[PDB]
């Protein structure tokens, strides 16, 4: 997270960390939509162009974390994956369209003051909250800067970082990239004349882009940290997976009934 802040304890109880066994390293962000399912971006598990192709056995899932590196014995919960599901039409060759993926935990997790699920939007919610000008929130443990002087500092934050970004008008997004953006994407970020900054960045991917419903006081996950061109550049914005549009697939995979 660029230009964000330290989050308060228990500020994003649905925030999940995707840990890599060996080497041990932080792979991506993610979210807890339930007692046994985690929602992340596809490109976190599969990106051929870089020979990226993880499986159920290569990763771990850490829920309830605050600190980036600590082993929070009393508060966090470490889960193992039972099965990974990547959107069948996830386009990693051109624009990362449908950059969504679900992960099924082996054993259900126990909710707590630190571990709680976020909600998924419905038609009306998505309809009224996803409007340009309205602000969303992004959270993660990724780079604090797109670039930095080696060995003189630490590109990574000590604790979970949080930033609030506004939604940008489609046309404006379309004009900022040579990339082909779909209806499965959305963009956020301040504009150059806006006098503010912030962005997600490497390591934040898979993280959730949430919004708060004034009427029901609940948080809704409207998007997923997807892609972008560097971090915090002027005249550029972050692209998030449109969670609402891909809901039917989620629905199909989950099968609660």
């Amino acid at each position: 997270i660029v230009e964000g802040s330290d989050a308060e304890i228990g500020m994003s109880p649905w925030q999940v960390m995707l840990f890599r066994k060996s080497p041990q390293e932080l792979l991506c962000g993610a979210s807890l939509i339930s007692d046994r399912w985690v929602l992340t971006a596809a490109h976190c598990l599969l990106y051929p162009p870089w020979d990226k192709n993880f499986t159920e056995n290569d990763l771990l899932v850490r829920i309830g974390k605050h600190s980036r590196t600590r082993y929070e014995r009393n508060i966090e919960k470490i889960s193992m994956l039972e099965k990974i599901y990547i959107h069948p039409r996830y386009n990693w060759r051109e624009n990362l369209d449908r950059d969504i993926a679900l992960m099924k935990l082996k054993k259900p997790v126990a909710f707590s003051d630190y571990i709680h699920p976020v909600c998924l939007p419905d038609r009306e919610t998505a309809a009224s909250l996803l409007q340009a000008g309205y602000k969303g929130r992004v959270t993660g443990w990724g780079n604090l800067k797109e670039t930095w002087t080696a060995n003189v500092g630490k590109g990574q934050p000590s604790v979970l970082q949080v930033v609030n970004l506004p939604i940008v008008e489609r046309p404006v997004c379309k004009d900022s990239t040579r990339i082909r953006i779909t209806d499965n994407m959305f963009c956020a970020g301040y504009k150059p004349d806006e006098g503010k900054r912030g962005d997600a960045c490497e390591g934040d991917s898979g993280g959730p882009f949430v919004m708060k419903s004034p009427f029901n006081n609940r948080w809704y996950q409207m998007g997923i940290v997807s892609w972008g061109e560097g971090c915090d550049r002027d005249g550029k914005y972050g692209f998030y997976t449109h969670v609402f549009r891909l809901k039917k697939w989620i629905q199909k995979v989950i099968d609660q009934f």
């Binding site: 066994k21 060996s22 041990q24 193992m80």
Partner: peptide, 10 residues
């Protein structure tokens, strides 16, 4: 960096 997690998971 990371503090070490239980090896049962690793």
């Amino acid at each position: 960096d990371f503090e070490e997690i239980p090896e049962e998971y690793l």
